[PDB]
Amino acid sequence: QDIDLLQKHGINVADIKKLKSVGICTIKGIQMTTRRALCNVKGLSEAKVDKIKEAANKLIEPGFLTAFEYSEKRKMVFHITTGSQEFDKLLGGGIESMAITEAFGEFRTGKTQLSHTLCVTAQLPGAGGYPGGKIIFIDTENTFRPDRLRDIADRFNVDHDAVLDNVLYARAYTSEHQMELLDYVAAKFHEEAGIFKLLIIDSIMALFRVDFSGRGELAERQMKLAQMLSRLQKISEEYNVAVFVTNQMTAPKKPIGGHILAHASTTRISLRKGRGELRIAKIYDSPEMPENEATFAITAGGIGD
Amino acid sequence: QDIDLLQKHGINVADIKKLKSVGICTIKGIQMTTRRALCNVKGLSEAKVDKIKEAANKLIEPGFLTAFEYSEKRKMVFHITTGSQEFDKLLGGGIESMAITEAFGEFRTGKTQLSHTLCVTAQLPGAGGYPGGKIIFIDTENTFRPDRLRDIADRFNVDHDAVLDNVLYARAYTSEHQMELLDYVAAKFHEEAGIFKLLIIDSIMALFRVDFSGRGELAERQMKLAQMLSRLQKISEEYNVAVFVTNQMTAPKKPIGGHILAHASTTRISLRKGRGELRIAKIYDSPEMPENEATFAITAGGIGD
Amino acid sequence: QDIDLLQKHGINVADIKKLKSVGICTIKGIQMTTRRALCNVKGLSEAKVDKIKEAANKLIEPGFLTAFEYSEKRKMVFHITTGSQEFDKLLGGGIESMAITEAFGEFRTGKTQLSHTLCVTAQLPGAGGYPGGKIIFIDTENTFRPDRLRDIADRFNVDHDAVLDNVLYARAYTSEHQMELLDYVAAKFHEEAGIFKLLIIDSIMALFRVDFSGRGELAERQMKLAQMLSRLQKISEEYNVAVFVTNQMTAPKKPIGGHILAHASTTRISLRKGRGELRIAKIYDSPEMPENEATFAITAGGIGD
Ligand SMILES: Nc1ncnc2c1ncn2[C@@H]1O[C@H](COP(=O)(O)OP(=O)(O)NP(=O)(O)O)[C@@H](O)[C@H]1O
Ligand SMILES: Nc1ncnc2c1ncn2[C@@H]1O[C@H](COP(=O)(O)OP(=O)(O)NP(=O)(O)O)[C@@H](O)[C@H]1O
Ligand SMILES: Nc1ncnc2c1ncn2[C@@H]1O[C@H](COP(=O)(O)OP(=O)(O)NP(=O)(O)O)[C@@H](O)[C@H]1O
Ligand SMILES: [Ca+2]
Ligand SMILES: [Ca+2]
Ligand SMILES: [Ca+2]
């Protein structure tokens, strides 16, 4: 899987070290990057930059699978529960494993509360044979109170050391620091193979919208979101991890980011408020599920019924 | 912390004094600042703008902390009491130290009275080992009667010189003067390290709403509030100070500013009137605390029971 | 104070006379005015609009005063008596000098009678070293009977020429004529420096309600009250004059204007009727004084005991 099986095909050891310096840590990463981007590194000319693909084509089929064989391949996709059974019923088992899930709401609809339950409920063996692993959290506003996890660790009856130890945390201060933080996401996913299960960005555009205030330069923000919306989709397919992002709204309402975020998101969940601690969850833009509604109440312990 | 430790890591003295000219005085202040805001200072170009960042990369980890190590880091967050124990119980210890707290009410619900007690009660050693320091006050309507402090200095039994000397005052006349006044906030926070504890803006939108009309030019204000709502969040994290702002209402009521202020605020407290001098305080949009209520009295001495 | 002191700091005579053409006649008047309101005068563009502000920056500190130094600065605030000692005791010395005071009542509670005493009692040297000066009156219904002053001039034992000569009068016919009348208020305040002490608008909303209907176009008024409620607060701070407005009521009662007037008013006095010629005065929304009551009488001579 890693860049070590290419040595027994023709590729020398002087190119392997330079290949891992750019970011490529997997064999699927060589087939996910174009030749133009591979020729932007000093030490590998076109002649030698095309020879690595020849050895990368004899490892995996560049062919056409039958759709019956593809359903056998799509049984490694897991599903992470939310904490409430009516809401998992809405998403069709929970949060998908090779996709990007978005949630947007007004201001108190429970977007940080949904992300705090997933830091606990994804370390627990649930349905479909899902074993449970560690969790990366990237927070952009400030809202990662770790004492809130010790409320949700009690209703699942797990100890507080093993639930505060499998969560890794890093705050991005700006959108460039949000960009450079995904290098350490891949470097942590690769050296610990298969014991990371999801990745949370607390908000993708708390830092994007603020930097580019001007209307005139707005277009570039759409070639810089498009960097990390496909960077994020490629990370979820090499390492088979879920991706959960949350979004804010603007003013009679619609989320921020427009059509690029709405296209690149596989599943969007709208969140609005009911009486007291009840909230409503509708489905926008899902490939399988229809537009239905549910009801989750924010309790001491996060999402419930 | 401050910028002399870059000098031993490859940066000459020739470019430090221009980084102190825009406003950056902290190692974290370069991590808060983009590579975009670092190019429009005249005299720093592209192959030399980068080497400050990678020499800032050796002072700090750009890594991923475990959440158990983050709880060890979040013991520098203090809590400032309000003046009444039932109301501190509602907020969970008082006013948080790395966040933005908002309070809105109708017209006599006690928003200026709550801000006048915090100019006295934050100079007093309270719970959690909070030592007590000085206070910045930015007032936008007119309501900073300093003789009201000499009513609240008596119920805590402190002398009147030491309670009128640790409060700094400046009135913003317009929203641009509100913007340029935060430069002197950082320049005062930096030369007196650690002996400033909070920052009060008496109202954020007494001046924002007036200059503009209605939907004629709605956009210019939501990218100009978004400047000083993240300017204010960044100041609270470099220097570890609390931020307390108050808000007005409009007409069956909801505050002014909409979703940008409602998103950027970590904690909102609604205030409404009871019989006589009793008021009610509900919680809107908190990351830890649930929606409860409490009663406080506006006595001679500010907030009481 | 006035605009000749900018001439010695780099500004030619060519651009002073156009700043005196929009209405700005004071060094503080440039600090009250944005860089936005300074561009729509034709003949002043972007690289030259800025240098007035930074040359206004050397006349004053843009800094932070200690609150002990601010109490030394707030001894130029005077207090004008009402005519009765029990009612001055309620307001804490009388009518404040850098604020907006509102009085509302049912229909015969004595709002015009209170305004007729202040045209006499403010020309008399009272408490706190208040010397006494001239008075601007803006009337909106019709009720400025000048023979009523010659009843109140007798109980203070002053002659009738010197009490009918220091009162200037102008009736606004509509709310736009109410708006354009504040230009002559500033032009009269500036050429006679320090010998004007208050400003009375007989009712702010006798004219702001006739022009607009119901809910169909409610907004065009809020954005237009908010013009002259901050226009009026800015006039009171450049020239240090009191502002007294009166308000009407509607139907179990509350005044007209809602939350914008209730926020922008520093002190509100409710007025209701007792037996015969006794009235009651309660305090709504004061920054210093508590909610108390004080009966006053409407005699031949206005307000008494
Ligand atoms: N411990 C708790 N118990 C019960 N309710 C809580 C608790 N903590 C927070 N809440 C409620 O959860 C809501 C806040 O949820 P939250 O996920 O923070 O929304 P949010 O979308 O992140 N707000 P924002 O980031 O500004 O958009 C509020 O209604 C709180 O009252
Ligand atoms: N010294 C005092 N003792 C008792 N009550 C007081 C005192 N000073 C003010 N009050 C009361 O406090 C209330 C005013 O509180 P305040 O905090 O100024 O409200 P506010 O929201 O700032 N008004 P506004 O700025 O126009 O929206 C009124 O009911 C006053 O009667
Ligand atoms: N010379 C006087 N001597 C005694 N009482 C008087 C005299 N002139 C007027 N009054 C009384 O004072 C009151 C006048 O009320 P006024 O000052 O007009 O309040 P008002 O609220 O402005 N009325 P309105 O303008 O219709 O809302 C009435 O009760 C009169 O009877
Ligand atoms: Ca949140
Ligand atoms: Ca106030
Ligand atoms: Ca009248």
CSV table of C-alpha atoms and ligand atoms in Angstrom, one decimal, chain A residues 107 111-113 141 143 202 246 248, chain B residues 263 285, ligand 4:
chain,number,residue,atom,x,y,z
A,107,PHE,CA,-27.0,30.0,15.5
A,111,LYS,CA,-23.7,22.1,15.3
A,112,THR,CA,-21.0,22.0,17.9
A,113,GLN,CA,-23.1,19.8,20.1
A,141,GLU,CA,-13.9,29.4,16.2
A,143,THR,CA,-15.6,25.8,20.8
A,202,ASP,CA,-15.7,22.7,13.1
A,246,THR,CA,-20.3,22.3,9.7
A,248,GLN,CA,-22.8,28.9,9.0
B,263,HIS,CA,-22.4,33.2,15.2
B,285,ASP,CA,-26.2,30.0,22.6
D,4,CA,CA,-20.3,26.4,17.2
